[PDB]
């Protein structure tokens, strides 16, 4: 209901099989992305093109193990409702170990050369979902939810064209000192 640090923590549960971790649409100037640096700079422009860099950092105990599959579903198909559907598109099987961070690129996958930064059906960017590949296994003496941190950024091939005002901040009265 409120803005919390917990909004940034993607919960992972132990002993979940063939299950979904998270799923989101890829309207970068909206939804979960609206407040990120990428989304904020994106809302100042009307058009965007290029690839996105999506990262996940595992924060659970060192003695845990998990294989996740992060899937990008290009536009034209619904958000995947099962892992089988998800793994037919662009995906990365991530084995959590000494390297706690996976970096999946969302390749620019579009016919039209530019997409609208504001949500639009024609210029839809597809879907992003994460699923349990094997499962999460916690060591003994540990219980509860472990968390993933998801990061967003732009690849060096990113483009932003047509300047516009941002709808993030508003005013009805002039400010003073």
């Amino acid at each position: 209901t409120k803005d919390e640090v917990n909004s940034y923590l993607i919960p992972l549960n132990a002993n979940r099989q063939n299950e979904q971790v998270f799923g989101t649409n890829l309207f970068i100037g909206d939804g979960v992305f609206k407040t990120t640096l990428l989304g904020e700079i994106v809302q100042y422009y009307t058009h965007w093109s290029g690839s996105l860099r999506f990262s996940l950092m595992y924060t659970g105990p060192a003695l845990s193990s998990a294989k996740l599959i992060l899937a990008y579903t290009p536009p034209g198909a619904r958000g995947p409702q099962d892992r089988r559907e998800a793994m037919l598109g662009t995906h990365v099987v991530w084995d959590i170990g000494l390297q706690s961070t996976i970096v999946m690129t969302i390749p620019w996958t579009s016919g039209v050369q530019f997409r609208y930064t504001d949500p639009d059906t024609y210029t839809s960017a597809g879907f992003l979902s994460c699923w349990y590949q094997t499962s999460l296994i916690l060591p003994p003496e540990t219980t509860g939810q472990v968390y993933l941190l998801s990061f967003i950024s732009a690849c060096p091939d990113f483009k932003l064209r047509l300047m516009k005002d941002t709808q993030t901040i508003s005013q009805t009265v002039a400010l003073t000192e």
């Binding site: 579903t73 290009p74 536009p75 037919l88 390749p107 620019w108 996958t109 579009s110 016919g111 039209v112």
Partner: protein, 250 residues
């Protein structure tokens, strides 16, 4: 004579079949300079580059014509249809082969024409839209002589279903099938679009219209119909963005 062999398919023509290549441009794969999508494209083999024959229409003395939309007409054709449904993006040229044979006693003239971006008009007026199911009929296409339907396009061939006059449709790449002269028409269509590649499902790049101009006049006592058969082969087809199979209405 002429023979075109694509994959495991062959069309032989005892007419000196001269092909129209729309705008003197052969189908080509998307070059790097024009590409925007970064994924390596899927360029199918013999499996798709082959002649698919659609079900034949019957040309009667009072038939108005038929309209197919590509790639919609081939959405259920072997491996091409599957690839079109499994990939997010696709571009393709076409070799269209319209066939209609008769005797030296028959008369009639078909206009075979390819219209890029043949946006259909609605018969209801105002700002009504033609529904998806009508603009994506499939291999059966649109029969211009049938009656109007709720959400269907207008079907007065005089106005090309778009508010332009039929006589002027020769500005588009076309061939006539004049029963005295020839029985086949061949048009090679390149990929035509404002974007380098596009979604094959929601957008029809071209429309193939076969229109009787000079009506069919069969000899006395003859059966008052002729079959018209359309054969299409995808050419320089590319697919990108493989994922779960798309779900379209009908």
């Amino acid at each position: 004579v002429q023979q075109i062999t694509l994959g495991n398919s062959t069309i032989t023509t005892q007419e000196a079949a001269n092909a129209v290549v729309c705008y003197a441009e052969w189908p080509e794969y998307l070059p790097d300079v024009d590409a925007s999508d970064v994924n390596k494209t899927s360029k199918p083999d013999t499996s798709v580059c082959r002649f698919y024959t659609l079900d034949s229409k019957t040309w009667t003395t009072g038939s108005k014509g038929w309209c197919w939309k590509l790639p919609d007409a081939l959405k259920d054709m072997g491996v091409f249809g599957q690839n079109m449904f499994f990939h997010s993006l696709g571009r393709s040229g076409y070799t269209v082969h319209v066939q209609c044979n008769a005797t030296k006693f028959h008369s009639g003239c078909l206009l075979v024409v390819v219209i890029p971006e043949h946006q259909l008009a609605s018969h209801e007026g105002g700002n009504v839209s033609v529904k998806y199911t009508f603009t994506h009929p499939g291999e059966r296409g649109i029969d211009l002589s049938s009656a109007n339907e709720v959400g269907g396009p207008v079907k007065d061939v005089i106005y090309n279903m778009n508010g332009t006059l039929l006589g002027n449709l020769l500005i588009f790449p076309h061939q006539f099938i004049n029963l005295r002269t020839n029985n086949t028409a061949t048009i090679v269509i390149p990929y035509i679009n404002s974007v380098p590649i596009d979604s094959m499902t929601r957008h029809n790049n071209v429309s193939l219209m076969v229109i009787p101009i000079a009506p069919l006049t069969v000899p006395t006592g003859a059966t008052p119909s002729l079959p018209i058969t359309v054969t299409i082969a995808p050419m320089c087809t590319e697919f990108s963005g493989i994922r779960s199979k798309s779900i379209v209405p009908q």
